[PDB]
Amino acid sequence: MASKPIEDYGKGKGRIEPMYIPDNTFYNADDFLVPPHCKPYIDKILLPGGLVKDRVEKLAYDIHRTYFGEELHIICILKGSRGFFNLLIDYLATIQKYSGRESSVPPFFEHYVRLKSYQGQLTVLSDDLSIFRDKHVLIVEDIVDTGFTLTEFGERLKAVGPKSMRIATLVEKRTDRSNSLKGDFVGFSIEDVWIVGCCYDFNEMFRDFDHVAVLSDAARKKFE
Amino acid sequence: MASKPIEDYGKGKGRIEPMYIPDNTFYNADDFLVPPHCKPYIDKILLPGGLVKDRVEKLAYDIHRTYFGEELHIICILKGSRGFFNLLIDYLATIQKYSGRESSVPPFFEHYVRLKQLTVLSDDLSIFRDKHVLIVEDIVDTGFTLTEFGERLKAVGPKSMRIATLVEKRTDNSLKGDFVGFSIEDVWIVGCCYDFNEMFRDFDHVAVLSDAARKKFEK
Amino acid sequence: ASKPIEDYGKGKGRIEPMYIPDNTFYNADDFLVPPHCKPYIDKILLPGGLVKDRVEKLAYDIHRTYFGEELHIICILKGSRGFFNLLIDYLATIQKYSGRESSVPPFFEHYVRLKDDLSIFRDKHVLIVEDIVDTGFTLTEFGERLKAVGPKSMRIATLVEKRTDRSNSLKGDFVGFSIEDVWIVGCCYDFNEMFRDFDHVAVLSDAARKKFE
Amino acid sequence: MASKPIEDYGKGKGRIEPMYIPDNTFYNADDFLVPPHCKPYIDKILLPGGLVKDRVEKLAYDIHRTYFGEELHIICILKGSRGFFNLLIDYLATIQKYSGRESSVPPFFEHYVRLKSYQGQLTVLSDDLSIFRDKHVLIVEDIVDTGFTLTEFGERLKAVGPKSMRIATLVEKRTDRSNSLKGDFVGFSIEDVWIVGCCYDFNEMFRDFDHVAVLSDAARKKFE
Ligand SMILES: O=c1[nH]cnc2c1ncn2[C@@H]1O[C@H](COP(=O)(O)O)[C@@H](O)[C@H]1O
Numbered sequence: 001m002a003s004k005p006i007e008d009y010g011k012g013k014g015r016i017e018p019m020y021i022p023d024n025t026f027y028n029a030d031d032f033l034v035p036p037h038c039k040p041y042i043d044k045i046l047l048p049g050g051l052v053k054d055r056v057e058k059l060a061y062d063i064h065r066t067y068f069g070e071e072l073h074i075i076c077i078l079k080g081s082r083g084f085f086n087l088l089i090d091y092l093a094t095i096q097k098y099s100g101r102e103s104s105v106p107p108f109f110e111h112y113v114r115l116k117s118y119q120g121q122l123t124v125l126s127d128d129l130s131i132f133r134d135k136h137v138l139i140v141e142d143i144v145d146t147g148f149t150l151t152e153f154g155e156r157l158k159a160v161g162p163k164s165m166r167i168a169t170l171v172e173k174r175t176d177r178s179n180s181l182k183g184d185f186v187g188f189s190i191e192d193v194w195i196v197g198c199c200y201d202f203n204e205m206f207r208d209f210d211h212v213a214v215l216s217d218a219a220r221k222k223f224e
Numbered sequence: 225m226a227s228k229p230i231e232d233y234g235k236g237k238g239r240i241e242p243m244y245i246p247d248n249t250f251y252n253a254d255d256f257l258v259p260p261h262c263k264p265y266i267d268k269i270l271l272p273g274g275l276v277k278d279r280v281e282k283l284a285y286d287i288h289r290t291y292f293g294e295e296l297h298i299i300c301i302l303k304g305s306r307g308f309f310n311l312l313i314d315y316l317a318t319i320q321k322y323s324g325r326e327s328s329v330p331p332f333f334e335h336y337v338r339l340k341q342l343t344v345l346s347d348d349l350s351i352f353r354d355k356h357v358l359i360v361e362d363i364v365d366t367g368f369t370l371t372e373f374g375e376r377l378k379a380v381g382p383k384s385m386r387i388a389t390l391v392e393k394r395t396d397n398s399l400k401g402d403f404v405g406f407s408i409e410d411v412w413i414v415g416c417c418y419d420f421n422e423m424f425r426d427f428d429h430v431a432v433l434s435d436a437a438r439k440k441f442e443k
Numbered sequence: 444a445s446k447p448i449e450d451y452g453k454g455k456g457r458i459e460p461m462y463i464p465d466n467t468f469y470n471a472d473d474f475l476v477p478p479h480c481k482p483y484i485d486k487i488l489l490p491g492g493l494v495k496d497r498v499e500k501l502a503y504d505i506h507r508t509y510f511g512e513e514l515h516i517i518c519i520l521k522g523s524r525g526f527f528n529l530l531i532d533y534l535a536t537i538q539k540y541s542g543r544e545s546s547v548p549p550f551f552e553h554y555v556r557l558k559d560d561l562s563i564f565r566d567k568h569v570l571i572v573e574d575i576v577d578t579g580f581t582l583t584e585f586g587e588r589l590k591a592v593g594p595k596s597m598r599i600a601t602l603v604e605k606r607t608d609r610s611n612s613l614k615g616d617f618v619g620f621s622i623e624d625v626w627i628v629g630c631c632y633d634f635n636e637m638f639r640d641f642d643h644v645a646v647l648s649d650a651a652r653k654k655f656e
Numbered sequence: 657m658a659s660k661p662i663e664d665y666g667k668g669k670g671r672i673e674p675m676y677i678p679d680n681t682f683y684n685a686d687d688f689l690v691p692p693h694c695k696p697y698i699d700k701i702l703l704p705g706g707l708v709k710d711r712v713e714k715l716a717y718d719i720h721r722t723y724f725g726e727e728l729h730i731i732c733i734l735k736g737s738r739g740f741f742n743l744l745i746d747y748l749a750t751i752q753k754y755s756g757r758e759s760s761v762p763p764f765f766e767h768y769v770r771l772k773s774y775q776g777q778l779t780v781l782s783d784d785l786s787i788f789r790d791k792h793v794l795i796v797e798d799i800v801d802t803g804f805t806l807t808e809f810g811e812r813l814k815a816v817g818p819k820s821m822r823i824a825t826l827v828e829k830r831t832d833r834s835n836s837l838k839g840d841f842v843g844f845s846i847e848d849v850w851i852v853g854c855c856y857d858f859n860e861m862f863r864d865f866d867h868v869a870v871l872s873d874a875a876r877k878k879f880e
């Protein structure tokens with residue numbers, strides 16, 4: 001199960017389709033507890049924080065099944081993936097701990113990279129990538145929009161010759177701006193809106209909000 | 225904030241309206257991790273367990289503001305309300321522990337009653353005379369259980385009486401809670417402590433009772 | 444898997460509990476204590492997180508013992524509410540992530556209170572969940588009434604057992620901790636209905652006893 | 657509350673003393689659920705994972721009081737402080753959300769720096785540190801042993817002229833090798849032993865184990 005041709009990277013071949021959130025589907029912010037610093041700026045909730053956690057649990061189970069009994073090197077793309085990545089590795093460990101079928105291989109080995117995208121150029125702040133040579137690698141990203149970040153990071157990783165490369169992203173946007181790259185383990189498919197909350201930011205703001213929400217015309221102005 | 229006329233009980237007067245879940249609107253069970261004993265029987269998830277939790281956090285916040293600084297007696301109607309009740313008391317305690325404005329009264333005093341048509345079995349209610357009482361119920365359908373118990377509780381002379389219920393069904397008129405998580409369509413739900421002949425309580429999400437479920441578990 | 448009725452209360456074949464030595468405690472000032480409890484809590488015998496870590500292991504032991512079997516778990520209200528809710532969360536999660544699949548639910552829950560119809564427990568595997576065993580009187584007497592209905596098997600899960608001077612003391616089958624003989628409050632444990640919502644297991648202090656007697 | 661002379665960095669001046677764990681005081685591993693990959697190696701548990709969580713809640717409350725009202729920039733020292741830092745920011749956000757207060761300022765601003773120490777040399781992998789000029793900065797670290805890493809990193813951060821600089825560390829060791837640096841928000845004071853578990857590693861092993869254990873002889877030999 002862990003094996004996968006390197007050329008399938010970014011194709012999402014053989015993936016389990018993500019949960020589909022239809023266009024214009026939102027919950028009211030007023031039905032949730034919204035902290036004061038966020039209250040003026042949040043109107044519509046796309047993904048309740050608890051719904052995110054439920055979905056991440058299923059993804060972790062899918063990931064556990066793929067890499068069962070294999071060494072798994074998981075890369076957190078900082079800053080955005082922090083929340084998703086921390087949830088995923090907590091579930092991977094717990095699943096492994098309670099599994100009725102045991103292994104002497106740890107559930108994962110964690111790695112961190114900082115990607116700064118300019119759409120154009122991609123900056124990388126990370127340790128040497130040669131460590132990934134011959135490893136099963138799982139890249140964790142918060143959201144895929146155009147696909148640029150993961151495509152060019154993907155080429156830089158293929159150069160060191162990993163054993164396999166897969167992508168986990170919490171959300172994928174349905175957008176005409178996409179280069180067609182898709183993830184292998186995807187939480188949700190959403191319409192083309194800018195989201196905030198649950199680590200998603202807008203100019204470094206709103207990461208601590210517990211739910212995934214849509215901007216607000218209001219908020220774009222005060223924080224642009 | 226805590227005072228309120230006893231005859232307002234069951235009217236939902238001045239409440240914050242619940243989250244409205246439109247008819248025929250569900251998540252696909254295949255998008256969630258479903259345990260093997262439930263796999264064959266769950267197809268439509270009405271309320272993900274996380275959505276439940278997020279909503280209960282908000283109700284606990286509304287409850288905390290309603291009884292702030294007041295002695296609050298909360299009654300759990302067993303067995304169905306235990307998961308919501310347990311979630312609610314956990315948020316109440318945490319909200320009070322992290323509050324700026326401090327207090328010497330505990331966040332709640334807990335009490336338990338059970339079901340028998342079923343009615344509540346509640347060992348000597350005279351301890352509720354002159355107390356602020358909050359009754360916690362898993363779901364309100366016809367409103368019979370809460371109406372019948374509410375009359376018996378009124379008889380001991382509580383200081384106030386309010387209802388928290390996770391879900392209220394839209395069914396043909398009717399008793400309403402004060403702190404209500406969700407308004408849903410008139411369907412039978414299982415999971416998250418909701419049962420169908422004692423089955424499905426431990427499933428983590430709120431699902432619609434399927435045909436397969438009904439046929440397998442019908443008494 | 445399931446066992447002789449006469450072994451009830453003996454803890455026969457059990458895994459001994461974590462043994463907390465006499466006079467061993469944490470300082471309450473190292474923890475966050477809410478204002479209603481702060482005047483009264485000084486010594487923490489069991490941090491709430493240690494209770495949760497230990498309940499995880501007991502739930503795993505219970506999962507193993509009843510694997511594949513229909514398990515009816517009885518919660519002795521009100522004190523056992525915290526422990527029982529922890530236990531059933533873990534039992535369900537362990538089953539859900541096991542992957543070593545089973546069609547029976549992880550448990551069927553049941554509730555009893557202190558001063559009902561036990562007939563439903565005839566021919567059932569029963570686990571009685573109790574918050575703490577002190578003299579053992581509560582579980583001895585309840586056990587005799589449950590034995591009268593003819594359960595298939597009976598075992599006891601108790602979060603704590605006190606070390607008393609009593610001989611032939613009732614022992615549980617899945618026990619979290621052995622502690623010194625002192626009154627404890629917090630984590631659902633009470634003193635005249637006070638302190639249940641505090642997050643940690645504390646020793647009842649003199650101030651607490653005098654204030655809440 | 658949040659102001660403090662830059663010269664006091666590393667002195668733990670005016671701090672709330674940590675929980676003191678006496679020498680040779682531990683829990684037995686058999687009383688906990690230990691996953692198959694760790695089972696042969698864990699004997700002694702110094703700090704159950706749940707005791708860590710309860711302690712970090714108190715430390716989060718202390719931090720919350722210290723920076724109440726101000727903009728707090730908290731830096732996660734990768735990789736070891738990942739789990740501590742994640743717990744910390746969860747608590748800070750939850751504390752603020754439930755507070756009587758109605759702040760308009762977010763509970764924190766997150767930042768990540770990977771440090772690699774050689775006792776010597778210190779490699780700093782991060783985004784530009786000059787964004788911390790005139791900010792209240794809290795450095796989050798997993799454990800202070802010699803104090804070398806935080807002394808050297810402290811000097812590199814003083815060069816951008818932060819408004820204040822404090823240190824949160826989950827554990828500090830009672831050692832002979834220490835240069836005397838001590839943290840301002842410290843969870844525990846422990847005897848001088850190597851610890852693994854709860855993100856603490858021994859050559860990149862054991863991070864996912866849920867409890868803080870002492871490195872055993874079986875672990876050393878196996879992972880030396
Ligand atoms: O809706 C959004 N909210 C917050 N960040 C986003 C959003 N969409 C894209 N991004 C950011 O842009 C990066 C990837 O964009 P891509 O390279 O166009 O696929 C993510 O890793 C995020 O940092």
Ligand SMILES: O=c1[nH]cnc2c1ncn2[C@@H]1O[C@H](COP(=O)(O)O)[C@@H](O)[C@H]1O
Pocket residue numbers: 304361362363364365366367368369370411412413414418419420
């Ligand atoms: O859809 C359902 N699923 C599970 N239990 C239900 C459902 N609808 C009603 N009940 C049970 O019926 C009891 C009382 O309903 P009511 O008295 O008609 O309002 C509730 O306390 C529930 O536990």
Ligand SMILES: O=c1[nH]cnc2c1ncn2[C@@H]1O[C@H](COP(=O)(O)O)[C@@H](O)[C@H]1O
Pocket residue numbers: 522574575576577578579580581582625626627628632633634
């Ligand atoms: O130290 C204690 N704190 C709180 N309740 C206790 C304590 N010791 C005994 N109890 C209560 O007394 C009952 C057990 O007493 P026993 O029958 O003497 O074993 C339990 O149901 C508890 O709820």
Ligand SMILES: O=c1[nH]cnc2c1ncn2[C@@H]1O[C@H](COP(=O)(O)O)[C@@H](O)[C@H]1O
Pocket residue numbers: 736773797798799800801802803804805806849850851852856857858
């Ligand atoms: O007992 C230990 N277990 C795991 N890592 C440790 C231990 N002691 C020190 N370290 C690592 O060594 C780094 C440097 O500690 P220093 O000696 O104070 O510079 C810390 O940030 C830890 O990551």
